[PDB]
Amino acid sequence: SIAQARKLVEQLKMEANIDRIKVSKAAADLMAYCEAHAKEDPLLTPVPASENPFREKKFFC
Amino acid sequence: SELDQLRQEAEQLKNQIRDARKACADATLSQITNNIDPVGRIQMRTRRTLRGHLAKIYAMHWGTDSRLLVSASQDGKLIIWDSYTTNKVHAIPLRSSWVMTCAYAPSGNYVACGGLDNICSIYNLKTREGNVRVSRELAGHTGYLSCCRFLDDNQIVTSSGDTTCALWDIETGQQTTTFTGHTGDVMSLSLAPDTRLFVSGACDASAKLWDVREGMCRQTFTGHESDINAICFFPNGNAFATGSDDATCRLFDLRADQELMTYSHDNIICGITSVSFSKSGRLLLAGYDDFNCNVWDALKADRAGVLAGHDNRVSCLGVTDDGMAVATGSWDSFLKIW
Amino acid sequence: SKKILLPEPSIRSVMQKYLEDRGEVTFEKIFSQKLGYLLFRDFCLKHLEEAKPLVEFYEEIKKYEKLETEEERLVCSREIFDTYIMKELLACSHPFSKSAIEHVQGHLVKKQVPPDLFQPYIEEICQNLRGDVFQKFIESDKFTRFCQWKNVELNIHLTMNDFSVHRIIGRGGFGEVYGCRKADTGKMYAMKCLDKKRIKMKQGETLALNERIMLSLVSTGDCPFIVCMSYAFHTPDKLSFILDLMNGGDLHYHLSQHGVFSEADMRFYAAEIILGLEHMHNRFVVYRDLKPANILLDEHGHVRISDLGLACDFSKKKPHASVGTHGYMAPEVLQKGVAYDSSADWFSLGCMLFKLLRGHSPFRQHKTKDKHEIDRMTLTMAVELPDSFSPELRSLLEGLLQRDVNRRLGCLGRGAQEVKESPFFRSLDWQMVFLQKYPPPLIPPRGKLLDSDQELYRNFPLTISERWQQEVAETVFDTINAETDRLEARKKTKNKQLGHEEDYALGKDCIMHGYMSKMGWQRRYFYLFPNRLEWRGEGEAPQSLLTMEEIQSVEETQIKERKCLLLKIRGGKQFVLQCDSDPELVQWKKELRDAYREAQQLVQRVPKMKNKP
């Protein structure tokens, strides 16, 4: 473990020096993203049954 | 002690790292989301059953076409299925019985798999001489293949019980980049949407993020109390979810450099084996060793629905790129589409 | 029913592992078995043109070994040297040492042609046969056929139904001898069938025990001059010995009809008896009951030494007890607490041969019960030699009937060779006595049930490989090979047109495969893999299985009088399995147990695969 503590120190030297953001901003954007893509999530917003391969679609290519 | 003289120094950085984050922790996602409407009882049903494997299913992965999927089983076979009809496209008998994982290349031209052979084997799905043949065996790891994902046809990333991950030039058949740091077997990896980054999750109960190109660990996320089994990227590329033996899923943010949210309940007592988000990221689907898959409101931490269709462990799942459907694989030997 | 039926070629998978675990897939071990030799022979002669000349050369030397005279050997040695030595050298096709070439040539130029002239070449042929060639043999059909044949052997369970009984031959103390044919091959044998009741009554359990043990110490090396054993087995009520058949009666019987024999006729019987005794004595057994009643005749009049029930093993622990018939025992034998070895038979032989010439034991002067006076004359009377006798005969008898072992013929020195070198036997060629070429003087005419005691008779059953393989080779071997080749050729042409299964065992990590049966019997084809046991009906792929993980244990058990494996499965569930043969049974047990213990050792190391709380 001689040079095991050496590289563990300088790994953290890197991990420490990134510029972080506030959580409220991070959560805000997460929330924003979901909201902007809710229309396009078929598990949240049903598509017509005839467009769904797993309910009523007939024609496939 | 030269090693002491750099151990407390490992602490005065591990504290400095807690500090900068605690300073950023001004609110919680649950507080920010406390206003928006609930998702409402997500009551999905089983729309297809895939029968064919003869023993436990350990892993599956959707093609980018949201139609074909590969599964991998204790029965020593990959099966590529067409979910729309239920037909099998290929049934691939493997050289080693002990496969644990499988992957589908974005192009649909290749599939990969591996297990205790410690090898990631790539299968050409369209041989010029119309056949399915092994086209490469990637050898280098000194432990078992636990997960793998193609960046493209000539590049793949692999996780392993030897504690490493690795990018491979498929042609050269070499590790173009190694990713060391983890102190326990690595169980899973997810590739960022831009495939410039990827996260990994390991039995050390930590998750890491890596620079695909520079080959370094940028950030290490902790909080779980036990093995991380599954890991999944949030669609926008700035967050990811993990599932643990500790009976919880957790959400981590890249730029906040910390955990936002924990999904658990006092009834849910066994480990998560698999996770992914729906297309919008609003839902987090997780698979359990209790035979169910729970559907969580990613934003509010509420349980939105359950998928109760399997008679043994739910071992894997995926959500189609088009968001149309979920696939659950199980130790009971069946996959179901929901 | 009666015909020998070989298992299918798929038996190779099970059988190869059985043999390999036992060290029996080596050139020495296979080459020196009769059927192994014959199958190795075909492979070299027909299917590899680099080993053709080697085996040809080998068989030509082996013919050479058996040439009777020195002149036949000058001619043949020269033919061999011409074809297999000089021509190959000129053809640059001679894979043999300079010393080999010179040993033979150096001898041949001096016209010295002993039967072992070509020994160095024998060892170098084996050297050239033993590597790549032997490996290519294993990789071929002919080893597949060896396995089929070996399978039948190691699964031999003899009963009475397997034989056909003709008529009686004699009676004895606890049982009787019979004439039998063996159904499958037709080979005629003698069946001695002693009864356990009478044995436990006379308390001669140590006797029957001795004979079976002495027989197996004797029944190797195809000796022409002892009645040898091919099998031994048991039934509810009796003990069988399947022995070499002799129909011509005994020399006691014939002495009485013919009367005393000439000096010339005794000689022939003596010659054959001496080679019998040489055989037993080289395997550390003294017969002890050498007498005319105990010598048997076949349809041509050649002789064999018969009942082994009083014979002794003198290798480890030397006998001292007086045993044998009274007018033939040795001074040492009668003496209380005195060790003796083979010396006993040499004295008895001298007694026995005098009886042929004179009608009575030398030491008996018509005394019936009185063993004592016989014994006292044995220990004082230097036997009186009639003037009728030749001086050659005289010294032979005087040599054999020495009272001290220190002097006797066949005792101090070199055994039977001292006898063979007597002037009495000086006309004989001993090679020719062995090969049975001397004409016989007489051709015979052509017209309280106990469950406890049963376990004393476990380890009685026995089959002598060497004996069984010769029976097969000389009878059914060629025709069954031809037949089961034809069977298989049509199996191939059937499968090729009925969508042949490109074998499901190939190109994976299958450990073993083969037929077995299972109730819930049902015959299915099984494939054992490192983490599971698949199985299938015919015309499909495996569509069900069992995992190494869910196997709790594997034991042998008994169903409807058969031996079958029992797997205890995780869910308190059971699984039962029949095999066709004892080797199959033994090998599945071992491989299943190996595989699940190793599989369950692995799964525990892998967090994704093992069970959780």
Ligand SMILES: CCCn1c(CNc2cccc(C(=O)NCc3c(F)cccc3F)c2)nnc1-c1ccncn1
């Ligand atoms: C014409 C029959 C001569 N023969 C005897 C004679 N001995 C014999 C035949 C049948 C049963 C017993 C028997 O019960 N032996 C038990 C026994 C011993 F084992 C040792 C000493 C005394 C004794 F009574 C003994 N044993 N085998 C043969 C025989 C006959 C024809 N071909 C080949 N062998």
